[PDB]
């Protein structure tokens, strides 16, 4: 048959990305995919942080 | 038959992303997918933070 | 037959994303999917935070 | 049959990316994919942090 | 049949990339892919951090 088993364990005592005026597009901790078929992942378009100025 | 089992455990004692004027597009802790078929993930379009200025 | 079992445990003693003037598009803690078929996930369109200025 | 098993364990006592005025495009800790078919990963478009100035 | 098994273990006691005015395009700790078919990875477009000035 089909048998899929997932065990994810996450602890944290320190700090993560402490600061001002920062961009973070894609972040992942303990990320996993196990489909029984194909895996299609798509990211298309605009992802932006604009603090004033002129952008085109 | 079909047998799918998921165990996710999350603890946290520190701090995460402490600050001002920040962008975070996609963030995931302890993320998992195990479909019995295919997996289709799509992100299409606009994702933006604009603090004044001119954008086109 | 079909057998699907889910165990999710979440504790937190620290702070998360403390600050002003911030954007967060997609955030997930302890997220999991195990359908007995396919998995179709779609995010299409506009997702934006605009603090003044001009956007087109 | 099909047999897919995932074990991810994450601990942290130090600090990560502490500072001001920073860009982070793609970050991943403990990231894994094992589909039973193909794996298609795509990132197409714009990903930018603009602090003033002129960009075209 | 199909047999895919993943074990990822991550500990950290030191610091990582502590400082101001920094760019990080693509970063990965403990990253692995083992699809049962092909693997297609694509990164196409713009990825930039602009602190003032003129860019075209």
What can be said about this structure in brief?
5 copies of one chain form a homopentamer. With 56 residues, the first copy, chain A, is mainly beta.
Task: Write a structural description.
Five copies of one chain form a homopentamer. The first copy, chain A, contains no helices and four strands. Chain A has strands at residues 2-10, 22-33, 39-51, 54-55. The relative contact order of chain A is 0.26. Chain A is flat and about 60 Å long. At the A-B interface, strand 1, strand 2, strand 3 and strand 4 of A face strand 1, strand 2, strand 3 and strand 4 of B. Chains A, B, C, D, E: Residues 1-28 are annotated as: Disordered. Chains A, B, C, D, E: Heterodimer of two subunits, one of which binds GTP. Interacts with polyadenylate-binding protein PAB1, and TPA1.
What's the alpha carbon Rg of chain A, rounded to whole Å?
18 Å
Counting copies of identical and different chains, the oligomeric state is: homopentamer
* Structural class by secondary-structure content of chain A: mainly beta
Helix content of chain A: under 10%
Order of helices and strands of chain A: EEEE
Largest interface: A-B, 56 and 56 residues
Helical run tally of chain A: 0
Instruction: Note the overall shape of chain A.
Output: flat
* N/C terminus separation of chain A: 54 Å
Beta-strand level of the residues of chain A, as a percent range? over 45%
Q: How many beta-strand runs of chain A?
A: 4
């Amino acid at each position: 048959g089909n048998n899929q088993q997932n065990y994810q364990q996450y602890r944290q005592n320190g700090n993560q990305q402490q600061g001002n005026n920062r961009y973070q597009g894609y972040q992942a901790y303990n990320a996993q995919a196990q489909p029984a078929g194909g895996y299609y992942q798509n990211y298309q378009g605009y992802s932006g942080y604009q603090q004033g100025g002129y952008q085109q």
